[PDB]
Design an enzyme around this catalytic site. Structure first.
Site, PDB file in Angstrom:
ATOM      1  N   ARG A 187    -136.458  72.047 -11.297  1.00 44.12           N
ATOM      2  CA  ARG A 187    -135.745  73.323 -11.064  1.00 44.12           C
ATOM      3  C   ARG A 187    -136.544  74.515 -11.596  1.00 44.12           C
ATOM      4  NH1 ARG A 187    -130.637  75.556 -14.089  1.00 44.12           N
ATOM      5  NH2 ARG A 187    -130.240  77.368 -12.715  1.00 44.12           N
ATOM      6  N   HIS A 218    -137.781  77.434  -9.204  1.00 45.89           N
ATOM      7  CA  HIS A 218    -137.280  78.797  -9.426  1.00 45.89           C
ATOM      8  C   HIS A 218    -138.396  79.762  -9.783  1.00 45.89           C
ATOM      9  CE1 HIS A 218    -132.669  78.258  -9.681  1.00 45.89           C
ATOM     10  NE2 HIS A 218    -133.197  77.394  -8.832  1.00 45.89           N
ATOM     11  N   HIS A 230    -132.918  67.601  -4.629  1.00 43.68           N
ATOM     12  CA  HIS A 230    -131.618  67.345  -5.240  1.00 43.68           C
ATOM     13  C   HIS A 230    -131.319  65.851  -5.395  1.00 43.68           C
ATOM     14  CE1 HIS A 230    -130.123  71.653  -4.094  1.00 43.68           C
ATOM     15  NE2 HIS A 230    -130.854  71.635  -5.196  1.00 43.68           N
ATOM     16  N   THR A 231    -132.246  65.017  -4.939  1.00 43.17           N
ATOM     17  CA  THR A 231    -132.168  63.584  -5.167  1.00 43.17           C
ATOM     18  C   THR A 231    -132.301  63.244  -6.658  1.00 43.17           C
ATOM     19  OG1 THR A 231    -132.732  61.486  -4.137  1.00 43.17           O
ATOM     20  CG2 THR A 231    -134.603  62.853  -4.975  1.00 43.17           C
ATOM     21  N   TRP A 264    -126.001  64.739  -7.182  1.00 43.07           N
ATOM     22  CA  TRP A 264    -125.987  64.518  -5.745  1.00 43.07           C
ATOM     23  C   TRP A 264    -126.055  63.028  -5.424  1.00 43.07           C
ATOM     24  CZ3 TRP A 264    -128.122  68.754  -8.036  1.00 43.07           C
ATOM     25  CH2 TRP A 264    -127.819  70.001  -7.463  1.00 43.07           C
ATOM     26  N   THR A 265    -126.552  62.238  -6.380  1.00 47.76           N
ATOM     27  CA  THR A 265    -126.806  60.812  -6.137  1.00 47.76           C
ATOM     28  C   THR A 265    -126.300  59.926  -7.273  1.00 47.76           C
ATOM     29  OG1 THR A 265    -129.048  60.755  -7.120  1.00 47.76           O
ATOM     30  CG2 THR A 265    -128.886  61.432  -4.773  1.00 47.76           C
ATOM     31  N   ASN A 295    -128.084  57.882  -8.764  1.00 47.06           N
ATOM     32  CA  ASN A 295    -129.246  57.662  -9.613  1.00 47.06           C
ATOM     33  C   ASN A 295    -130.020  58.971  -9.828  1.00 47.06           C
ATOM     34  OD1 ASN A 295    -129.406  54.436  -9.872  1.00 47.06           O
ATOM     35  ND2 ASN A 295    -128.836  54.940  -7.759  1.00 47.06           N
ATOM     36  N   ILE A 339    -133.802  59.118 -10.587  1.00 43.75           N
ATOM     37  CA  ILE A 339    -134.646  58.368  -9.654  1.00 43.75           C
ATOM     38  C   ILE A 339    -134.884  59.193  -8.410  1.00 43.75           C
ATOM     39  CG2 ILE A 339    -134.866  56.304  -8.184  1.00 43.75           C
ATOM     40  CD1 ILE A 339    -134.957  55.892 -11.329  1.00 43.75           C
ATOM     41  N   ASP A 357    -135.686  59.403  -4.777  1.00 36.60           N
ATOM     42  CA  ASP A 357    -135.750  58.625  -3.541  1.00 36.60           C
ATOM     43  C   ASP A 357    -135.027  59.381  -2.432  1.00 36.60           C
ATOM     44  OD1 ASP A 357    -133.038  58.131  -4.022  1.00 36.60           O
ATOM     45  OD2 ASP A 357    -133.356  55.949  -4.395  1.00 36.60           O
ATOM     46  N   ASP A 413    -126.273  72.337   1.174  1.00 34.16           N
ATOM     47  CA  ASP A 413    -126.672  70.978   1.532  1.00 34.16           C
ATOM     48  C   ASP A 413    -126.020  70.636   2.873  1.00 34.16           C
ATOM     49  OD1 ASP A 413    -128.082  70.343  -1.017  1.00 34.16           O
ATOM     50  OD2 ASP A 413    -126.088  70.129  -1.895  1.00 34.16           O
TER      51      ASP A 413
HETATM   52  C1  HEM Z   1    -132.325  74.602  -0.603  1.00 32.48           C
HETATM   53  C2  HEM Z   1    -131.770  75.625  -1.279  1.00 32.48           C
HETATM   54  C3  HEM Z   1    -131.287  75.333  -2.710  1.00 32.48           C
HETATM   55  C4  HEM Z   1    -130.102  75.639  -3.239  1.00 32.48           C
HETATM   56  C5  HEM Z   1    -128.949  76.382  -2.541  1.00 32.48           C
HETATM   57  C6  HEM Z   1    -130.075  75.154  -4.601  1.00 32.48           C
HETATM   58  C7  HEM Z   1    -129.018  75.282  -5.468  1.00 32.48           C
HETATM   59  C8  HEM Z   1    -128.903  74.585  -6.651  1.00 32.48           C
HETATM   60  C9  HEM Z   1    -127.817  74.690  -7.599  1.00 32.48           C
HETATM   61  C10 HEM Z   1    -126.578  75.620  -7.461  1.00 32.48           C
HETATM   62  C11 HEM Z   1    -128.090  73.861  -8.619  1.00 32.48           C
HETATM   63  C12 HEM Z   1    -127.224  73.624  -9.873  1.00 32.48           C
HETATM   64  C13 HEM Z   1    -127.748  74.343 -11.114  1.00 32.48           C
HETATM   65  C14 HEM Z   1    -126.843  73.887 -12.238  1.00 32.48           C
HETATM   66  O1  HEM Z   1    -125.615  74.177 -12.161  1.00 32.48           O
HETATM   67  O2  HEM Z   1    -127.338  73.229 -13.204  1.00 32.48           O
HETATM   68  C15 HEM Z   1    -129.336  73.189  -8.345  1.00 32.48           C
HETATM   69  C16 HEM Z   1    -129.945  72.257  -9.162  1.00 32.48           C
HETATM   70  C17 HEM Z   1    -131.145  71.646  -8.914  1.00 32.48           C
HETATM   71  N1  HEM Z   1    -132.090  72.018  -7.969  1.00 32.48           N
HETATM   72 FE1  HEM Z   1    -131.650  73.214  -6.356  1.00 32.48          FE
HETATM   73  N2  HEM Z   1    -131.283  74.545  -4.876  1.00 32.48           N
HETATM   74  C18 HEM Z   1    -132.049  74.629  -3.728  1.00 32.48           C
HETATM   75  C19 HEM Z   1    -133.330  74.178  -3.599  1.00 32.48           C
HETATM   76  C20 HEM Z   1    -134.002  73.380  -4.491  1.00 32.48           C
HETATM   77  C21 HEM Z   1    -135.390  73.019  -4.397  1.00 32.48           C
HETATM   78  C22 HEM Z   1    -136.324  73.559  -3.278  1.00 32.48           C
HETATM   79  C23 HEM Z   1    -135.677  72.194  -5.408  1.00 32.48           C
HETATM   80  C24 HEM Z   1    -137.034  71.535  -5.755  1.00 32.48           C
HETATM   81  C25 HEM Z   1    -137.769  70.986  -4.780  1.00 32.48           C
HETATM   82  C26 HEM Z   1    -134.461  72.015  -6.163  1.00 32.48           C
HETATM   83  C27 HEM Z   1    -134.322  71.228  -7.269  1.00 32.48           C
HETATM   84  C28 HEM Z   1    -133.194  71.162  -8.028  1.00 32.48           C
HETATM   85  C29 HEM Z   1    -132.974  70.154  -9.040  1.00 32.48           C
HETATM   86  C30 HEM Z   1    -133.925  68.999  -9.419  1.00 32.48           C
HETATM   87  C31 HEM Z   1    -131.615  70.479  -9.627  1.00 32.48           C
HETATM   88  C32 HEM Z   1    -130.877  69.731 -10.758  1.00 32.48           C
HETATM   89  C33 HEM Z   1    -131.268  70.395 -12.080  1.00 32.48           C
HETATM   90  C34 HEM Z   1    -130.638  69.659 -13.253  1.00 32.48           C
HETATM   91  O3  HEM Z   1    -130.312  68.444 -13.141  1.00 32.48           O
HETATM   92  O4  HEM Z   1    -130.459  70.297 -14.322  1.00 32.48           O
HETATM   93  N3  HEM Z   1    -133.453  72.758  -5.583  1.00 32.48           N
HETATM   94  N4  HEM Z   1    -129.813  73.660  -7.134  1.00 32.48           N
HETATM   95 NA    NA Z   2    -131.682  59.437  -6.452  1.00 40.97          NA
END
Ligand code: HEM
Ligand code: NA
Length: 250
Positions: free
Chosen positions: A38, A42, A163-164, A179-180, A182, A185, A187, A208
């Site tokens: 993230r 970001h 988000h996997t 979202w998953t 796991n 992990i 995948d 999503d």
């Molecule tokens: C496609 C448009 C996207 C939207 C609308 C979006 C929105 C969000 C939101 C609202 C969260 C929750 C933040 C929280 O409450 O902790 C989140 C988490 C996350 N995002 Fe996205 N995101 C997007 C794209 C991406 C991209 C491009 C990546 C990296 C390739 C990504 C990776 C992640 C990951 C790994 C988390 C989980 C973070 C954690 O576990 O603390 N996202 N996203």
């Molecule tokens: Na997963």
């Protein structure tokens, strides 16, 4: 493609290699891969191609950028990496954060995303409001990823698959849960879950869901759910591009 990467010294390259190893151990131990991914996204996702502003240039460490609502909780990420970064003073924060994102994908079992050093740390954070809005849909995704960042529809779907790993938190975005099944992990389960419908305990953002109804995004969701190798290939391509926005003649 279209990239001319800068020369960095041997000592710089040595530090990249050593930092990559230290990041693997640290991220695995701390269970913070999703948060680091993230942080990298970001940092990168603020790039505007028309003005060549924003992008993966170290600005996310700035209190002003951390304060952006879309960045809630990323101050934790920055703090977590600070002791490690201090062991590698030669590296830019720009490179270090992108390297952390690459490592986050790798240690959770994802593809090996190519990494090229040389990003310079820039003094001024971009304007707030450029990152994707979870409540919006396909038009919005194209405005942000396509019109601003300069990425493709394929890159949008593949990167959504990030988000996997991980979860939302009600105190950060307001959304809540993984979202998953796991969340540490990497995948193609994000797409599998998106297809199967809503399952209790699992999260789907409106952003999503917008992938499911768009004529171009939907065949890609289907492909990735059916073929994890195809997902990994397209994901590695997209993450590389994201991590390099505005960098190395963009
Ligand atoms: C496609 C448009 C996207 C939207 C609308 C979006 C929105 C969000 C939101 C609202 C969260 C929750 C933040 C929280 O409450 O902790 C989140 C988490 C996350 N995002 Fe996205 N995101 C997007 C794209 C991406 C991209 C491009 C990546 C990296 C390739 C990504 C990776 C992640 C990951 C790994 C988390 C989980 C973070 C954690 O576990 O603390 N996202 N996203
Ligand atoms: Na997963």
């Amino acid at each position: 493609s279209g990239k001319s990467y800068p020369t960095v010294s041997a000592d710089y390259q040595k530090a990249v290699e050593k930092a990559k190893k230290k990041l693997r151990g640290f991220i695995a131990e701390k269970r913070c891969a999703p948060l680091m991914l993230r942080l990298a996204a970001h940092s990168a996702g603020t790039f505007d191609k028309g003005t060549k502003t924003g992008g993966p240039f170290g600005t996310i460490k700035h209190p002003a950028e951390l304060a952006h609502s879309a960045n809630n909780g990323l101050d934790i990420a920055v703090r977590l990496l600070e002791p490690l970064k201090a062991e590698f003073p030669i590296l830019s924060y720009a490179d270090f954060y992108q390297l952390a994102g690459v490592v986050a994908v790798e240690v959770t079992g994802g593809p090996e995303v190519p990494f090229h050093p040389g990003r310079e740390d820039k003094p001024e954070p971009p304007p707030e409001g450029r990152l994707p809005d979870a409540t919006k849909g396909s038009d919005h995704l194209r405005d942000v990823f396509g019109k601003a960042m300069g990425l493709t529809d394929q890159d949008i779907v593949a990167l959504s698959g990030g988000h996997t790993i991980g979860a939302a938190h009600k105190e950060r975005s307001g959304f809540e849960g993984p979202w998953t099944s796991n969340p540490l992990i990497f995948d193609n389960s994000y797409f599998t879950e998106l297809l199967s419908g809503e399952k209790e305990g699992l999260l789907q953002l409106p952003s999503d869901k917008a992938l499911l109804s768009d004529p171009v995004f939907r065949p890609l969701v289907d492909k990735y759910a059916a073929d994890e190798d195809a997902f990994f290939a397209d994901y590695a391509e997209a993450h590389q591009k994201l991590s390099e926005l505005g960098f190395a003649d963009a």
